[PDB]
Amino acid sequence: SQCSSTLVKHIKAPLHLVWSIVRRFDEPQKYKPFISRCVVQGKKLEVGSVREVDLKSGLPATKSTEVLEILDDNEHILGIRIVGGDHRLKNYSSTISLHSETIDGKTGTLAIESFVVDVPEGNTKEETCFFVEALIQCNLNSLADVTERLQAESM
Amino acid sequence: SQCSSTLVKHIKAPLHLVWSIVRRFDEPQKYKPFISRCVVQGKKLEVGSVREVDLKSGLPATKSTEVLEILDDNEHILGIRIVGGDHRLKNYSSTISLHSETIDGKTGTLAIESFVVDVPEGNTKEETCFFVEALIQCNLNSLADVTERLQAESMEKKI
Numbered sequence: 001s002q003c004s005s006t007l008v009k010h011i012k013a014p015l016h017l018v019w020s021i022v023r024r025f026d027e028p029q030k031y032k033p034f035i036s037r038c039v040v041q042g043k044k045l046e047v048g049s050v051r052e053v054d055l056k057s058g059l060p061a062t063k064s065t066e067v068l069e070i071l072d073d074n075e076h077i078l079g080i081r082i083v084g085g086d087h088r089l090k091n092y093s094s095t096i097s098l099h100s101e102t103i104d105g106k107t108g109t110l111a112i113e114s115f116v117v118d119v120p121e122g123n124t125k126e127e128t129c130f131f132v133e134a135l136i137q138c139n140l141n142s143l144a145d146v147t148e149r150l151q152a153e154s155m
Numbered sequence: 156s157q158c159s160s161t162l163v164k165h166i167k168a169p170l171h172l173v174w175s176i177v178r179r180f181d182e183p184q185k186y187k188p189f190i191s192r193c194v195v196q197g198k199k200l201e202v203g204s205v206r207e208v209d210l211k212s213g214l215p216a217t218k219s220t221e222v223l224e225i226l227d228d229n230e231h232i233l234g235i236r237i238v239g240g241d242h243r244l245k246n247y248s249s250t251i252s253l254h255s256e257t258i259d260g261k262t263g264t265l266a267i268e269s270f271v272v273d274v275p276e277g278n279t280k281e282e283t284c285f286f287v288e289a290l291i292q293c294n295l296n297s298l299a300d301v302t303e304r305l306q307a308e309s310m311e312k313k314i
Contacts, residue, residue: 056277090213120214121211131289
């Protein structure tokens with residue numbers, strides 16, 4: 001009836017740098033490959049700020065409206081809830097927490113993204129949820145590439 | 156700039172049965188899981204015939220317009236081309252063939268499906284193809300499920 005799943009990604013870059021990008025609720029296109037532009041109505045980073053995402057051309061969907069639900073600069077957590085948009089996903093919530101770990105002897109970040117979303121009418125978990133897992137996996141993969149180029153650029 | 160890939164499915168049912176379903180160009184609902192309605196204009200399944208597919212509710216796209224390109228009852232090939240719909244898929248074309256096999260001392264069918272589609276611009280092949288492979292793997296796995304249940308039912312009719 002509803003599907004929750006958790007995606008994990010190891011990143012070869014320092015936590016503060018990774019947070020610096022993740023934390024931008026007004027700039028998801030920073031690393032999310034399917035976003036074209038983003039507009040935040042109100043003060044960009046408060047809990048309750050709505051954003052209006054425009055996806056890129058030639059994808060199944062074109063727009064998404066999302067609400068920032070948690071931004072914790074302390075425990076490094078970011079929660080959103082999608083609330084509208086032509087993708088037709090219903091009741092989607094997603095949290096990304098960021099933990100400090102050590103990868104290949106140097107400092108690194110674990111990304112943990114959880115999400116919950118209703119399985120559409122007439123379709124099974126087995127048909128649907130691997131698409132949502134894929135998108136996020138892709139989103140995290142891109143965060144890694146982006147952050148690591150940034151951490152490499154610093155040298 | 157183009158996304159090309161082939162998928163494979165080993166199905167535990169006779170070829171006559173799988174083809175029985177797969178050749179149904181007017182009813183991809185029989186096994187494809189996202190499809191709600193299929194209208195076919197004029198001739199049912201003759202090369203050139205077009206189908207308007209309606210997707211089920213709550214999905215990122217609602218309609219697809221596809222064309223029958225190959226229907227071969229003898230060689231067991233079904234080729235289609237998508238030419239419209241709101242999935243925004245550009246130059247999608249797919250083709251599926253069914254082949255007979257004897258594996259583990261029990262008859263069966265290998266299905267093998269190859270697709271080709273344009274990659275959305277401003278996105279890379281890496282970010283986008285696995286999505287198309289996955290949907291097809293999804294249809295293939297479903298085909299095995301549907302087909303194999305039918306075999307089991309038929310084998311239940313043992314008297």
